[PDB]
């Protein structure tokens, strides 16, 4: 099977190769941003798109190029043609609105509450947790790796098991 693009979240000129799994917020937190200190007037850059994937919560969003999208045979490529058209007719044509939008997008990566846990645990003893995301409805809850959730949202785990 293949991945499917749900929504184009953002666009940037970023460091060549700063795409894929190393760009999730949790890979950035563990190993540093692959795009850190990028200055488009000092080194090779490429147009990168921030992708929200179908069936994966916002913590799994990754930066991708049209090349990486085509190489991984992702579905929803019609949205790329659509986003590129929309992006071009914005540059031709706000900063408080883009800032507000960005803060919102950051909230979708925050666990508000844990509402279920798996009976099975990993070898490291972590169950998976069903997460309610800040600023998103319950229809957007998702199962997540307990080891990943414990890194930043231990307080949500503690609240869930305190009940």
């Amino acid at each position: 099977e293949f991945e499917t693009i749900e929504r184009f979240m953002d666009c940037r000129i970023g460091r060549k190769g700063a795409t894929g799994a190393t760009t999730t917020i949790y890979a950035v937190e563990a190993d540093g941003d692959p795009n850190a200190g990028f200055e488009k007037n000092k080194e090779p850059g490429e147009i990168q798109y921030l992708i929200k994937w179908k069936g994966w919560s916002h913590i799994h969003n990754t930066w991708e190029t049209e090349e990486t999208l085509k190489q991984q045979n992702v579905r929803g490529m019609k949205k790329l043609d659509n986003y590129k058209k929309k992006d071009q007719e914005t540059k031709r044509w706000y900063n408080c609105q883009q800032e507000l939008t960005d803060d919102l997008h950051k909230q979708y990566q925050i666990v508000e509450r844990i509402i279920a846990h798996s009976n099975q645990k990993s070898a490291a003893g972590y169950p998976d947790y069903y997460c309610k995301w800040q600023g998103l409805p319950y229809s957007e809850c998702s199962w997540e790796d307990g080891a990943l959730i414990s890194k930043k949202f231990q307080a949500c785990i503690d609240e869930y098991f305190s009940r």
Binding site: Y26, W56, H60, D128, W143, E144, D145, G146, L148
Partner: peptide, 7 residues
């Protein structure tokens, strides 16, 4: 039923 993004 969780997953992580892996290279």
């Amino acid at each position: 039923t969780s997953r992580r993004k892996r290279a």
